[PDB]
């Protein structure tokens, strides 16, 4: 299930990394990038991920569907938002809040999308 494989992943996963009295996870779907149960995305049926796009502009949002859990190719669906700063975060908030799709991670996804926008903004 969820906790059953969390008790396996929690110490001996390949994405896990430990140095400088810190612990992280280098997963592509992990948001806030630290080792935690609520933030781990490969375990849960409902998974939100916020990534930069293949191009320089735009932010892609990764949504794990509930049907193909054991099918890794058709598990995740990617959508690109190449929009302005306010309505991009509003679109992600309307994705996570109003669809009843894992509401515990909406604010972390908004923070990560703001970080990717600050990254893709041109440097001073």
């Amino acid at each position: 299930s969820a906790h059953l494989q969390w008790m396996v992943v929690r110490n001996c996963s390949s994405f896990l990394i430990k140095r400088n009295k810190q612990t992280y996870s280098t997963e592509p779907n992990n948001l806030k990038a630290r080792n935690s149960f609520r933030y781990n995305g490969l375990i849960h049926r409902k998974t939100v991920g916020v990534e930069p796009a293949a191009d320089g502009k735009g932010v892609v949002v990764v949504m794990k569907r509930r049907s193909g859990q054991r099918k890794p190719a058709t598990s995740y669906v990617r959508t690109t938002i190449n929009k302005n700063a306010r309505a991009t975060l509003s679109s992600i908030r309307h994705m996570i809040r109003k669809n009843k799709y894992h509401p515990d991670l909406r604010m972390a996804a908004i923070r990560r999308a703001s970080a990717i926008l600050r990254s893709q903004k041109p440097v001073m």
């Binding site: 990394i17 400088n20 810190q22 280098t26 806030k32 990038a33 923070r111 970080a115 990254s119 440097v123």
Partner: protein
């Protein structure tokens, strides 16, 4: 315009000097690393007045300002560009640090990616 931390508390330290080993001044074979003396008639181990201090648990720093740089950041050793997407989110609290064995052509990419991600590097001019 350096990268400021989120909160900057007063980093108080109870002791800044090194706990040097007993009789490290006399002999060259004795290193400065602390080893607890466990003799029967030694002066340091039973806490005589005016002797070398011992590393007790009372000298521990506060948990808010432990492992903290004087800038206000916490160190994290980074080998390549892929380990900066780990620290793009935890930006205002923790900082990055490039390893010694990393070549300059990859240090340039690490510094450029950290400048994009607004992450402070403790050694931004490591090779040049």
């Amino acid at each position: 315009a350096a990268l400021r931390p989120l909160v900057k508390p007063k980093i108080v330290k109870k002791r800044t000097k090194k706990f040097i080993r007993h009789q490290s001044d006399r002999y060259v074979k004795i290193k400065r690393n602390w080893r607890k003396p466990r003799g029967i008639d030694n002066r340091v181990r039973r806490r005589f007045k005016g002797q070398i201090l011992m590393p007790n648990i009372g000298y521990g720093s506060n948990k808010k300002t432990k492992h903290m740089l004087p800038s206000g950041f916490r160190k994290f050793l980074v080998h390549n560009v892929k380990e900066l997407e780990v620290l793009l989110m935890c930006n205002k609290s923790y900082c990055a640090e490039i390893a010694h064995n990393v070549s300059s052509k990859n240090r340039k990419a690490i510094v450029e990616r950290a400048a994009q991600l607004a992450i402070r590097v403790t050694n931004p001019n490591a090779r040049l």
